[PDB]
Amino acid sequence: PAAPQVYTIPPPLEQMAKDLVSLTCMITDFFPEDITVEWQWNGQPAENYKNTQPIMDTDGSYFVYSKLNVQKSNWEAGNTFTCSVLHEGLHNHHTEKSLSH
Amino acid sequence: PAAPQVYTIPPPLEQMAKDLVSLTCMITDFFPEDITVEWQWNGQPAENYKNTQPIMDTDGSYFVYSKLNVQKSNWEAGNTFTCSVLHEGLHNHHTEKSLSH
């Protein structure tokens, strides 16, 4: 199996004028398609996120995007957001990547 | 209708060590779901990109991600990449956002 590459992306600059911002977790280059993605807020389970369905890339691998919505004040307040991933190609089948303002 | 918000995202810093990088086009907050997304390279049609299927967000709107893979030398060489979007909520149903190293 090919372990996924996990990248965390902050809100686009042009989105900083809105009251609600979006955090992105970009997961690429994995195989097989079976995977689980979840978000956490300061260690606690978050709920306002949506994951896309796995798409096969040009090279036969898969990729998925997960978008979490949060109040702009929550982001600039400096809270910590974590993207949690479950996949059989990872060391012990799990990994995490955190984001902070 | 609700016109989509189009955001262009460069490759994550940790991905700059690989030979292949990814450019992301983040399209959010639109309605209805019908939408067309395409990528261009210096004004010409590109081919190595994949779009996710529209996902209904918490507020009833939709969002889509489009990922274009390019050689790291192509990016650092300074070529121009453009993300084109067709949606009935936009002025004349079309808009563009460009990216450059």
PDB file of C-alpha atoms in Angstrom:
ATOM      1  CA  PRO A   1       0.000   0.000   0.000  1.00  0.00           C
ATOM      2  CA  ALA A   2       1.096   3.611  -0.449  1.00  0.00           C
ATOM      3  CA  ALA A   3       0.798   5.789   2.664  1.00  0.00           C
ATOM      4  CA  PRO A   4      -1.009   9.115   2.138  1.00  0.00           C
ATOM      5  CA  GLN A   5       0.702  12.498   2.153  1.00  0.00           C
ATOM      6  CA  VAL A   6      -1.088  14.803   4.586  1.00  0.00           C
ATOM      7  CA  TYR A   7      -0.970  18.576   4.086  1.00  0.00           C
ATOM      8  CA  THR A   8      -2.825  21.146   6.127  1.00  0.00           C
ATOM      9  CA  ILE A   9      -3.882  24.470   4.530  1.00  0.00           C
ATOM     10  CA  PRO A  10      -4.978  27.731   6.281  1.00  0.00           C
ATOM     11  CA  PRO A  11      -7.764  30.049   4.981  1.00  0.00           C
ATOM     12  CA  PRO A  12      -7.081  31.942   1.728  1.00  0.00           C
ATOM     13  CA  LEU A  13      -6.192  35.596   2.303  1.00  0.00           C
ATOM     14  CA  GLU A  14      -9.293  36.704   0.389  1.00  0.00           C
ATOM     15  CA  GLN A  15     -11.439  34.713   2.784  1.00  0.00           C
ATOM     16  CA  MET A  16     -10.176  36.682   5.818  1.00  0.00           C
ATOM     17  CA  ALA A  17     -12.786  39.395   5.308  1.00  0.00           C
ATOM     18  CA  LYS A  18     -15.675  36.971   5.979  1.00  0.00           C
ATOM     19  CA  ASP A  19     -17.064  35.938   9.383  1.00  0.00           C
ATOM     20  CA  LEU A  20     -16.670  32.238   8.561  1.00  0.00           C
ATOM     21  CA  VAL A  21     -13.404  30.722   7.307  1.00  0.00           C
ATOM     22  CA  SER A  22     -12.450  27.294   5.905  1.00  0.00           C
ATOM     23  CA  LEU A  23      -9.475  25.057   6.815  1.00  0.00           C
ATOM     24  CA  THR A  24      -8.375  22.434   4.286  1.00  0.00           C
ATOM     25  CA  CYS A  25      -6.713  19.039   4.729  1.00  0.00           C
ATOM     26  CA  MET A  26      -5.204  17.793   1.477  1.00  0.00           C
ATOM     27  CA  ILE A  27      -4.544  14.031   1.429  1.00  0.00           C
ATOM     28  CA  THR A  28      -2.819  12.587  -1.617  1.00  0.00           C
ATOM     29  CA  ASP A  29      -0.898   9.708  -3.192  1.00  0.00           C
ATOM     30  CA  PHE A  30      -2.470   6.836  -1.234  1.00  0.00           C
ATOM     31  CA  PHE A  31      -3.678   3.280  -2.097  1.00  0.00           C
ATOM     32  CA  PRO A  32      -6.113   1.630  -1.556  1.00  0.00           C
ATOM     33  CA  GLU A  33      -9.152   3.968  -1.505  1.00  0.00           C
ATOM     34  CA  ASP A  34     -10.369   2.952   1.983  1.00  0.00           C
ATOM     35  CA  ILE A  35      -9.617   5.804   4.382  1.00  0.00           C
ATOM     36  CA  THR A  36     -11.101   7.749   7.325  1.00  0.00           C
ATOM     37  CA  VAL A  37     -10.684  11.475   7.907  1.00  0.00           C
ATOM     38  CA  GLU A  38     -11.724  13.446  10.986  1.00  0.00           C
ATOM     39  CA  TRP A  39     -11.073  16.902  12.462  1.00  0.00           C
ATOM     40  CA  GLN A  40     -10.418  17.931  16.085  1.00  0.00           C
ATOM     41  CA  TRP A  41     -10.588  21.282  17.913  1.00  0.00           C
ATOM     42  CA  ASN A  42      -8.122  21.504  20.832  1.00  0.00           C
ATOM     43  CA  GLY A  43      -8.176  17.721  21.118  1.00  0.00           C
ATOM     44  CA  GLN A  44     -11.982  17.497  21.069  1.00  0.00           C
ATOM     45  CA  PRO A  45     -14.129  16.124  18.189  1.00  0.00           C
ATOM     46  CA  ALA A  46     -15.249  18.736  15.656  1.00  0.00           C
ATOM     47  CA  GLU A  47     -18.471  18.343  13.642  1.00  0.00           C
ATOM     48  CA  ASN A  48     -18.773  21.000  10.911  1.00  0.00           C
ATOM     49  CA  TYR A  49     -16.597  19.351   8.265  1.00  0.00           C
ATOM     50  CA  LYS A  50     -17.274  17.467   5.012  1.00  0.00           C
ATOM     51  CA  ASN A  51     -14.989  14.992   3.184  1.00  0.00           C
ATOM     52  CA  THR A  52     -15.083  14.486  -0.583  1.00  0.00           C
ATOM     53  CA  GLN A  53     -15.166  10.933  -1.990  1.00  0.00           C
ATOM     54  CA  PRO A  54     -11.789   9.354  -2.933  1.00  0.00           C
ATOM     55  CA  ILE A  55     -10.816  10.191  -6.534  1.00  0.00           C
ATOM     56  CA  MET A  56      -8.313   8.126  -8.506  1.00  0.00           C
ATOM     57  CA  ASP A  57      -5.467  10.309  -9.761  1.00  0.00           C
ATOM     58  CA  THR A  58      -3.688  10.101 -13.112  1.00  0.00           C
ATOM     59  CA  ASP A  59      -1.088   7.707 -11.673  1.00  0.00           C
ATOM     60  CA  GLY A  60      -3.516   5.215 -10.174  1.00  0.00           C
ATOM     61  CA  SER A  61      -3.274   6.559  -6.625  1.00  0.00           C
ATOM     62  CA  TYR A  62      -6.118   8.326  -4.755  1.00  0.00           C
ATOM     63  CA  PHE A  63      -6.642  11.703  -3.089  1.00  0.00           C
ATOM     64  CA  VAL A  64      -9.258  13.251  -0.807  1.00  0.00           C
ATOM     65  CA  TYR A  65     -10.005  16.756   0.482  1.00  0.00           C
ATOM     66  CA  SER A  66     -11.593  17.583   3.854  1.00  0.00           C
ATOM     67  CA  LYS A  67     -12.949  21.072   4.605  1.00  0.00           C
ATOM     68  CA  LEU A  68     -13.669  22.332   8.132  1.00  0.00           C
ATOM     69  CA  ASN A  69     -15.653  25.523   8.682  1.00  0.00           C
ATOM     70  CA  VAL A  70     -14.916  27.736  11.700  1.00  0.00           C
ATOM     71  CA  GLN A  71     -15.795  31.222  12.928  1.00  0.00           C
ATOM     72  CA  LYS A  72     -13.076  33.718  11.982  1.00  0.00           C
ATOM     73  CA  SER A  73     -12.818  34.666  15.672  1.00  0.00           C
ATOM     74  CA  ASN A  74     -12.137  31.034  16.571  1.00  0.00           C
ATOM     75  CA  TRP A  75      -9.257  30.883  14.068  1.00  0.00           C
ATOM     76  CA  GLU A  76      -7.644  34.223  15.030  1.00  0.00           C
ATOM     77  CA  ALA A  77      -8.134  33.419  18.719  1.00  0.00           C
ATOM     78  CA  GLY A  78      -5.352  30.900  18.188  1.00  0.00           C
ATOM     79  CA  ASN A  79      -7.143  27.622  18.897  1.00  0.00           C
ATOM     80  CA  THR A  80      -5.532  24.403  17.597  1.00  0.00           C
ATOM     81  CA  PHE A  81      -7.098  22.354  14.804  1.00  0.00           C
ATOM     82  CA  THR A  82      -6.026  18.800  13.972  1.00  0.00           C
ATOM     83  CA  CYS A  83      -6.706  16.632  10.882  1.00  0.00           C
ATOM     84  CA  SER A  84      -6.776  12.922  11.810  1.00  0.00           C
ATOM     85  CA  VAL A  85      -6.245  10.219   9.172  1.00  0.00           C
ATOM     86  CA  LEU A  86      -6.788   6.438   9.225  1.00  0.00           C
ATOM     87  CA  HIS A  87      -5.198   4.311   6.499  1.00  0.00           C
ATOM     88  CA  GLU A  88      -3.531   0.866   6.434  1.00  0.00           C
ATOM     89  CA  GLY A  89      -0.370   2.141   4.782  1.00  0.00           C
ATOM     90  CA  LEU A  90       0.521   4.407   7.716  1.00  0.00           C
ATOM     91  CA  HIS A  91       2.742   3.520  10.701  1.00  0.00           C
ATOM     92  CA  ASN A  92       0.082   1.856  12.986  1.00  0.00           C
ATOM     93  CA  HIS A  93      -2.597   3.057  10.507  1.00  0.00           C
ATOM     94  CA  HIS A  94      -2.872   6.638  11.761  1.00  0.00           C
ATOM     95  CA  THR A  95      -1.294  10.105  11.597  1.00  0.00           C
ATOM     96  CA  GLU A  96      -2.108  13.723  12.540  1.00  0.00           C
ATOM     97  CA  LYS A  97      -1.267  17.235  11.311  1.00  0.00           C
ATOM     98  CA  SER A  98      -2.138  20.406  13.236  1.00  0.00           C
ATOM     99  CA  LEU A  99      -2.962  23.984  12.247  1.00  0.00           C
ATOM    100  CA  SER A 100      -2.827  27.175  14.328  1.00  0.00           C
ATOM    101  CA  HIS A 101      -3.177  30.904  13.613  1.00  0.00           C
TER     102      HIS A 101
ATOM    103  CA  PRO B   1     -28.434  31.362  -7.353  1.00  0.00           C
ATOM    104  CA  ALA B   2     -25.266  31.840  -5.308  1.00  0.00           C
ATOM    105  CA  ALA B   3     -22.076  32.679  -7.214  1.00  0.00           C
ATOM    106  CA  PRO B   4     -19.067  30.504  -6.272  1.00  0.00           C
ATOM    107  CA  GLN B   5     -16.056  31.878  -4.417  1.00  0.00           C
ATOM    108  CA  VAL B   6     -12.915  30.933  -6.347  1.00  0.00           C
ATOM    109  CA  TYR B   7      -9.629  30.606  -4.475  1.00  0.00           C
ATOM    110  CA  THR B   8      -6.312  29.535  -5.980  1.00  0.00           C
ATOM    111  CA  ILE B   9      -3.738  27.735  -3.803  1.00  0.00           C
ATOM    112  CA  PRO B  10      -0.005  27.138  -4.433  1.00  0.00           C
ATOM    113  CA  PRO B  11       1.816  23.914  -3.463  1.00  0.00           C
ATOM    114  CA  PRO B  12       2.318  23.330   0.291  1.00  0.00           C
ATOM    115  CA  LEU B  13       5.861  24.100   1.478  1.00  0.00           C
ATOM    116  CA  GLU B  14       6.517  20.471   2.455  1.00  0.00           C
ATOM    117  CA  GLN B  15       5.660  19.391  -1.075  1.00  0.00           C
ATOM    118  CA  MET B  16       8.435  21.555  -2.605  1.00  0.00           C
ATOM    119  CA  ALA B  17      10.996  18.804  -1.966  1.00  0.00           C
ATOM    120  CA  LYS B  18       9.337  16.410  -4.449  1.00  0.00           C
ATOM    121  CA  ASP B  19       9.744  16.544  -8.248  1.00  0.00           C
ATOM    122  CA  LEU B  20       5.980  16.826  -8.812  1.00  0.00           C
ATOM    123  CA  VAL B  21       3.826  19.478  -7.126  1.00  0.00           C
ATOM    124  CA  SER B  22       0.073  20.147  -6.901  1.00  0.00           C
ATOM    125  CA  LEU B  23      -1.934  23.345  -7.483  1.00  0.00           C
ATOM    126  CA  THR B  24      -5.383  23.548  -5.922  1.00  0.00           C
ATOM    127  CA  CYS B  25      -8.479  25.439  -6.960  1.00  0.00           C
ATOM    128  CA  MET B  26     -10.904  25.825  -4.046  1.00  0.00           C
ATOM    129  CA  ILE B  27     -14.486  26.662  -5.152  1.00  0.00           C
ATOM    130  CA  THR B  28     -17.059  27.189  -2.394  1.00  0.00           C
ATOM    131  CA  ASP B  29     -20.479  28.545  -1.400  1.00  0.00           C
ATOM    132  CA  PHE B  30     -22.333  28.000  -4.686  1.00  0.00           C
ATOM    133  CA  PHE B  31     -25.819  26.899  -5.799  1.00  0.00           C
ATOM    134  CA  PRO B  32     -27.149  24.927  -7.686  1.00  0.00           C
ATOM    135  CA  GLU B  33     -24.612  22.077  -8.016  1.00  0.00           C
ATOM    136  CA  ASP B  34     -24.130  22.232 -11.795  1.00  0.00           C
ATOM    137  CA  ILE B  35     -20.645  23.553 -12.479  1.00  0.00           C
ATOM    138  CA  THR B  36     -17.677  23.163 -14.842  1.00  0.00           C
ATOM    139  CA  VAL B  37     -14.046  23.511 -13.826  1.00  0.00           C
ATOM    140  CA  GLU B  38     -11.014  23.538 -16.153  1.00  0.00           C
ATOM    141  CA  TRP B  39      -7.298  24.385 -15.941  1.00  0.00           C
ATOM    142  CA  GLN B  40      -5.093  26.245 -18.437  1.00  0.00           C
ATOM    143  CA  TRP B  41      -1.309  26.488 -18.886  1.00  0.00           C
ATOM    144  CA  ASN B  42      -0.237  29.864 -20.331  1.00  0.00           C
ATOM    145  CA  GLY B  43      -3.652  30.215 -21.935  1.00  0.00           C
ATOM    146  CA  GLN B  44      -3.591  26.669 -23.354  1.00  0.00           C
ATOM    147  CA  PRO B  45      -5.727  23.658 -22.265  1.00  0.00           C
ATOM    148  CA  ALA B  46      -4.170  21.506 -19.533  1.00  0.00           C
ATOM    149  CA  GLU B  47      -5.012  17.829 -19.020  1.00  0.00           C
ATOM    150  CA  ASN B  48      -3.569  16.362 -15.814  1.00  0.00           C
ATOM    151  CA  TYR B  49      -6.193  17.611 -13.355  1.00  0.00           C
ATOM    152  CA  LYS B  50      -9.068  15.957 -11.484  1.00  0.00           C
ATOM    153  CA  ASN B  51     -12.189  17.553  -9.997  1.00  0.00           C
ATOM    154  CA  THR B  52     -14.079  16.167  -6.977  1.00  0.00           C
ATOM    155  CA  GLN B  53     -17.875  15.744  -7.100  1.00  0.00           C
ATOM    156  CA  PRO B  54     -19.930  18.620  -5.605  1.00  0.00           C
ATOM    157  CA  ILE B  55     -20.513  18.142  -1.873  1.00  0.00           C
ATOM    158  CA  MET B  56     -23.420  19.808  -0.061  1.00  0.00           C
ATOM    159  CA  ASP B  57     -22.030  21.984   2.750  1.00  0.00           C
ATOM    160  CA  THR B  58     -23.628  22.501   6.179  1.00  0.00           C
ATOM    161  CA  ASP B  59     -25.536  25.582   4.995  1.00  0.00           C
ATOM    162  CA  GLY B  60     -27.073  23.924   1.952  1.00  0.00           C
ATOM    163  CA  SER B  61     -24.516  25.327  -0.531  1.00  0.00           C
ATOM    164  CA  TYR B  62     -21.982  23.328  -2.534  1.00  0.00           C
ATOM    165  CA  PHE B  63     -18.207  23.173  -2.825  1.00  0.00           C
ATOM    166  CA  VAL B  64     -15.697  21.514  -5.161  1.00  0.00           C
ATOM    167  CA  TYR B  65     -11.915  21.037  -5.270  1.00  0.00           C
ATOM    168  CA  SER B  66      -9.811  20.725  -8.414  1.00  0.00           C
ATOM    169  CA  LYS B  67      -6.213  19.444  -8.286  1.00  0.00           C
ATOM    170  CA  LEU B  68      -3.655  20.032 -11.087  1.00  0.00           C
ATOM    171  CA  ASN B  69      -0.348  18.126 -10.965  1.00  0.00           C
ATOM    172  CA  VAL B  70       2.744  19.719 -12.536  1.00  0.00           C
ATOM    173  CA  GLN B  71       6.512  19.144 -12.620  1.00  0.00           C
ATOM    174  CA  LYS B  72       8.297  21.248  -9.985  1.00  0.00           C
ATOM    175  CA  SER B  73      10.470  22.774 -12.730  1.00  0.00           C
ATOM    176  CA  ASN B  74       7.352  23.864 -14.623  1.00  0.00           C
ATOM    177  CA  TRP B  75       6.153  25.739 -11.538  1.00  0.00           C
ATOM    178  CA  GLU B  76       9.485  27.327 -10.590  1.00  0.00           C
ATOM    179  CA  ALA B  77      10.091  28.194 -14.233  1.00  0.00           C
ATOM    180  CA  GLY B  78       7.367  30.782 -13.774  1.00  0.00           C
ATOM    181  CA  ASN B  79       4.674  29.552 -16.162  1.00  0.00           C
ATOM    182  CA  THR B  80       1.118  30.819 -15.621  1.00  0.00           C
ATOM    183  CA  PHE B  81      -1.685  28.536 -14.478  1.00  0.00           C
ATOM    184  CA  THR B  82      -5.327  29.489 -14.687  1.00  0.00           C
ATOM    185  CA  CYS B  83      -8.435  27.955 -13.125  1.00  0.00           C
ATOM    186  CA  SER B  84     -11.601  28.502 -15.199  1.00  0.00           C
ATOM    187  CA  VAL B  85     -15.118  28.224 -13.766  1.00  0.00           C
ATOM    188  CA  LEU B  86     -18.552  28.054 -15.422  1.00  0.00           C
ATOM    189  CA  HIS B  87     -21.589  28.636 -13.175  1.00  0.00           C
ATOM    190  CA  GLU B  88     -24.963  30.341 -13.722  1.00  0.00           C
ATOM    191  CA  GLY B  89     -24.454  32.576 -10.700  1.00  0.00           C
ATOM    192  CA  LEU B  90     -21.435  34.426 -12.104  1.00  0.00           C
ATOM    193  CA  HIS B  91     -21.358  37.535 -14.235  1.00  0.00           C
ATOM    194  CA  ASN B  92     -21.946  36.040 -17.756  1.00  0.00           C
ATOM    195  CA  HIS B  93     -21.513  32.514 -16.184  1.00  0.00           C
ATOM    196  CA  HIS B  94     -17.714  32.528 -16.112  1.00  0.00           C
ATOM    197  CA  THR B  95     -14.654  33.688 -14.168  1.00  0.00           C
ATOM    198  CA  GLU B  96     -10.881  33.078 -13.944  1.00  0.00           C
ATOM    199  CA  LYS B  97      -8.111  33.151 -11.309  1.00  0.00           C
ATOM    200  CA  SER B  98      -4.409  32.891 -12.242  1.00  0.00           C
ATOM    201  CA  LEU B  99      -1.391  31.511 -10.346  1.00  0.00           C
ATOM    202  CA  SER B 100       2.343  32.045 -10.782  1.00  0.00           C
ATOM    203  CA  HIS B 101       5.550  31.175  -8.945  1.00  0.00           C
TER     204      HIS B 101
END
